[PDB]
């Protein structure tokens, strides 16, 4: 008659590491790290992402003529920008505070496009010939940004002091754009805006802007040695914008009522496909469908994701040292 | 092992005992079988489950890297952001990997101790009414039927009841 | 005859958590986290804070006419700014590098106000009519900043090239301010500064400044469609400032010898009352009087404070598992 | 428990023993009473005090958030500062909460071991001159007065002195 | 100590035993000598070496401070960089110092347990064929030559072989 | 006949600390922290550092006449700048984006000096008299930066529109410099560049620059009340630079083909001697030759260095509690 004390063994070959010993086979354990992803983009809270396709962020909100697919109202859980997108700033020049603009746009979830300054706004000037071969549409060889108006003189008269005002009486901030044109020589300057010192001045309750054309011949980009300085700003609720210029003004035409997301903002630069799927965690390199605590997929994500670490595996022993007999 | 039981004076485990982490194997006239000690097994299950859940809870925050861009004249703040994000990455990678190694060591020791203590618990009841073979097995100096066996397993073994019989067979 | 081995028990109901078990009652334990605060501001190292009251930081160091209570010398252990303070920049416009200015001021413990450029400095111009209904005092409807001088023309003559120089021969840096006025139209420009191109140029051994008026009609703020560009700088010990202008100059009048604190700097935006008390740790939301290692009150504080964490409780077991009988 | 003493083979604690963490309860002709083992109690007090002080010392630095403001065109560095400050907040919150859970577990085990070792220390001296009841209590096979009791408590119990008397009563 | 052996019921160490952490001292007709238990010593060496190497591996990343400068109008991002670098410095200083204190405590306990378990391993083989002096020493009730001694040390001691002789001398 | 179980003791007096006990003597232990350094600079990957000697970074890449020792091609594993170096910007003025420039230069390992615009480039002007007593060489009292050309008028004629172009047809980015001169009064302005509005305009495919002289008398520095605004930029591979000015131009002359290091970049400000030695870890305060895991020497280093901590000692117990008898 015998009684023995003993412990569980099984057919486990799953191992863990300890401070004292590597490769310890245990009867039971749990993996805390996720390394699997669905290489695709899905919806977040049943809200679809915005595919910018062949347009860059700049091309999108500036209203590049080849970005009409995106034109107008958009809602998004996050933004997907394709790495080799060709349609950005068509007429050469710098969009000022570009990085801050991208960060601002990223912090939003919806824009509503509206007409902020109809062409009727600018008196004594031409609002019909503002096009360029640098900015073609899909059907027309010479067009321009859907949100801007390139203003030039009437055929022979001088460029007068034009003025515009907009009072944001709504509850939402307004993202709007404008520009200053810099001709390559004084000839083009005179041909388009006439003679004399030119200025572009704009102001709100909290912003002042003042710029003059800087005439010089710069290297040819998209067949242009001239440039445009593009600008952006945000008209706060209750604020008023005043526009005043006597030339070289790329005027604001359409703008965006901007809805800032309460949540976290994301802009993914990726070639991955957006499919008809749902997810709770969207990584820049794919979807994570897991209940695990850690992941080694990517530190860049939106939604409720596991903590990112460099580890290959984080396996906790739960059972005991597996010593099966024989 | 730290407590000397698992892979110790009890050289190996029992694939035959499938319903618990810790238990018994008895032999008497009615035959032999495995039985898990329900109390010690469940106590360990609750503890280990609490440990796993606690680790998960403490790890339930995330540092979030951003997709923010920096111009050619923003190399410093650009590099600042990179070093920061990499910094927290290294901290949390360290925290997770070190914790796992530490807790794995202690978890295995816990199981080892529970086996040791279960052995001690039986040794204490049986006293000299049984012979300790040194491998976690006890040979009774008396006939121990199914209810005698169960009394050992549930901690109510009656030493005086079998004292005289055991002494006679022992001496 | 018996001897037994045993362990302490008592009437404790205080519990701790472990990795293995929640709610373990122990005979002895210590709480490491402080969650109590005195909802008030006290002195730090027996040095009183500076209450800005109804004035913002801008209103204070610009010398807003309604901030005379603060005017002059100040010493502080930290600064308290009230959230709904009304007296800041009275005449509309932007104070440039405002955030850096606040950070600089925060890093100090004392300013000494002195006259840096007496009105005698500016020759051939009027230093007596620089007032505005936008900047009233408590007794006068039209005043101006105590530290600046709004310079205009003599009744009919033109605005001449005025000059000023100051040599910091002291041992302390000097915080000073100046401005450039931007009229809404050329009419006001001519009426105040005459005709011709106007400039404001200032320079030291390490700083260059150059600005010209930018005339435009901006939305009315405090009954003004004009603006002032306010500026600030720090004249290092041994440096010299040269001021040169032919118009649109809001000249530096009074300035501050600045004493930078060796310690940590703080500016608390709060409605909490400053009372007659001492403290070693001052949180933005109150005083901590404790010897505990952690606190969950606030990450913002000055003085010697416990480490801030999100935890509700950090109780260390010191005694053993409490198992009282019966 | 890991060492099986506290809430183990010694089922409960003594509210009657107020002057120490670990001790004795004796019964003889002069009556009964509680006495703390001063050596093991003080050693534990010193260790635990050292642990608490060590934890406090290591936690004696502070990350300091700043009241710095950022303009509308400083969203990136503004968000950088926020993520940094929140980052260290999460790290230290983790460090504190995890350490407390870990040390609480080990502190309780320490007390458990000290009780176990105190029991072993008495068992070792008494040998077969006493009967182990299995609950931390020993019944002497001989008369053990106050000075005999104290000799057990201070580790100088004289086994040969009571050997013959114990044997006679035991047999 | 937690396991009560080192600086415990075995009051001191052996300067005479130079070839191992854990071992034996025997006395018989052929004289006396020290011998390290090779198995337990090597097992401990491998474990501790693994621990040191593991700690080194986890600590094998570096936060890198930069020599970047900031102008007079960059006090905020300048102070941001300083607080960040100091922040990680404090985190890693904490991690290193706390880990060392924790692992030092556990390392010493490990050695203590290994000594305890080695003692238990001998006690288990010898049974009543020897007398436990309570200081880790066993006095045989029989003649134990060099090969008898070695059988104890390598775990193959033959209790039945010396049972009758021991009993006679014991009784 | 006896057998005893026991443990090792030795003559160690080396101690460790634990959570439970300070000063525990152990038979064996290992120190993980290095506190020793060789107070000197050595080579990294058998590549020597660049000693700037008596020249600052500015003096070096601007081509300060007293920095000819450094002039031309340089390769470096890191840069050593001496704290009291005297030869920087000799003709007073600000080098714009100085901190970004230092960070950029630090991220490199080699520059190759070449002539980017020969003096032949600038037609109708004088390229021979651009010197100043503020910038003497070691043999000449009035010289100028080896990489810049101070352009002035021919003795009596007016300053014409000068132009220059450079097409980076190479594979490496080009670091180049230029300037705008600001005379103290209109007299010097007229004497050097003639009359009329002056401009300096430069542009690439991604950069626009436009500056006009800002005439004002600033405090005398190196015997000069005038100033120069120095600028820098990087001409990317395949980009073209166009220079256009009608006065006040400090033209680019020599530039640098820039090789960015794949590794980590360092600039050490130190007085320590560079000797003929090799190292794998170079701290700003000395060389670490160690296999230890931690170090308390400095957080600033280049190469493969141990982790920096504030600790005095990090000693791990490996052996057991040392209790030698007697
Ligand atoms: C640990 O495990 C053991 C079993 O190995 C258990 O002890 C046994 O408990 C059962 C309770 O059911 C006892 O069975 C009783 O039997 C009597 C008559 O049996 C006689 O024969 C046995 C054979 O050995 C003799 O040893 C006895 O002395 C008896 O003379 C019976 O009257 C009694 O009560 C009723 O039984 C009928 C069926 O329900 C009912 O219809 C009738 O009306 C009776 O009223 C029991 O059936 C058994 O004898 C025990 N073993 C021994 C050796 O005595 C322990 O269970 C304890 O648990 C607590 C809660 C008590 O309530 C009892 O159940 C036991 O003391 C168990 N311990 C624990 C902690 O789980
Ligand atoms: C552990 O605790 C025990 C007590 O339980 C203690 O052992 C006792 O120590 C005391 C020392 O004071 C001893 O008392 C001595 O008594 C003799 C005469 O007593 C006789 O009666 C007893 C009754 O049982 C007999 O057993 C003895 O054999 C004796 O024949 C007395 O002469 C002696 O010295 C002086 O006492 C007078 C009072 O001070 C003085 O005026 C006179 O001039 C004498 O010189 C002591 O008083 C007692 O006998 C011990 N117990 C037993 C059973 O023998 C242990 O204390 C030890 O500590 C070390 C430091 C030694 O110096 C001694 O104190 C003990 O050996 C204690 N151990 C530890 C480690 O604390
Ligand atoms: C633990 O340590 C012990 C030693 O303390 C060891 O046990 C001994 O093993 C040796 C093996 O070499 C045995 O020696 C044999 O001796 C016989 C004849 O010896 C007689 O005298 C002894 C004296 O006490 C008697 O007790 C015996 O009963 C014998 O009658 C000899 O024939 C034998 O084989 C050859 O020996 C010659 C030399 O090589 C060879 O030339 C000849 O042709 C023989 O074929 C051995 O020499 C010794 O007797 C053992 N001790 C006792 C008390 O019996 C344990 O070693 C074991 O290891 C395994 C691998 C086996 O293969 C054996 O070596 C042992 O059983 C050791 N255990 C471990 C785990 O290390
Ligand atoms: C044995 O094999 C694997 C584990 O190695 C798994 O299927 C299971 O634990 C066992 N298989 C069955 C059929 O039980
Ligand atoms: C042990 O670790 C080694 C790594 O060298 C590898 O073979 C494997 O992970 C483990 N071996 C097994 C599971 O047989
Ligand atoms: C903007 O419109 C609102 C209309 O409710 C008006 O009250 C406000 O005065 C306007 N502001 C300006 C600057 O015109
Ligand atoms: C978590 O995921 C694992 C996948 O390995 C699964 O086995 C487990 O059941 C899941 N748990 C819950 C609560 O869904
Ligand atoms: C019992 O009650 C509380 C603790 O629960 C405290 O006052 C003390 O520990 C005890 N009271 C007294 C009077 O001792
Ligand atoms: C145990 O924890 C629970 C939380 O669910 C709460 O009731 C309390 O904190 C504890 N219970 C007690 C102290 O009775
Ligand atoms: C400033 O004043 C000091 C007076 O000690 C004088 O030495 C120095 O030259 C002055 N600097 C200027 C630029 O006037
Ligand atoms: C620390 O504060 C606590 C408050 O709970 C107090 O009980 C304790 O005595 C204080 N310690 C010291 C050293 O002042
Ligand atoms: C004893 O002295 C030191 C250690 O304290 C060291 O030289 C060595 O361990 C011993 N010396 C010799 C000669 O063995
Ligand atoms: C113990 O620590 C103290 C610090 O107060 C110091 O004397 C030394 O480090 C240690 N003492 C020794 C090694 O004797
Ligand atoms: C620069 O030179 C290359 C020579 O291969 C030429 O193809 C390219 O068009 C040139 N670019 C400009 C802007 O002149
Ligand atoms: C590491 O350095 C120490 C210096 O104390 C030396 O003793 C040891 O041998 C070195 N280890 C290796 C592997 O070089």
Residue numbers in the entry:
A (entry chain A), C (entry chain A), F (entry chain A): 1 to 326
B (entry chain B), D (entry chain B), E (entry chain B): 1 to 171
Copied sentences from the primary study:
Receptor-binding specificity of HA is a key determinant for viral host range. HA molecules of human viruses preferentially bind to α(2,6)-linked receptors, those of avian viruses to α(2,3)-linked receptors, while those of swine viruses to both. Two H6 HA proteins, one from each group, were chosen for structural and functional investigation: A/chicken/Guangdong/S1311/2010(H6N6) (GD H6) in Group I and A/Taiwan/2/2013(H6N1) (TW H6) in Group II.
We used the pentasaccharide, α(2,6)-linked lactoseries tetrasaccharide c (LSTc), for X-ray crystallographic study of H6 HAs with human-like receptors. In contrast, TW H6 HA-LSTc has clear density for the first three sugar rings of LSTc. This higher-sitting position alleviates the discriminating effect of HA1 226 for avian or human-like receptors. This explains why TW H6 HA, with the hydrophilic residue Q226, interacts with human-like receptors in a similar way as pandemic H2 and H3 and transmissible H5 HAs that possess the hydrophobic residue L226.
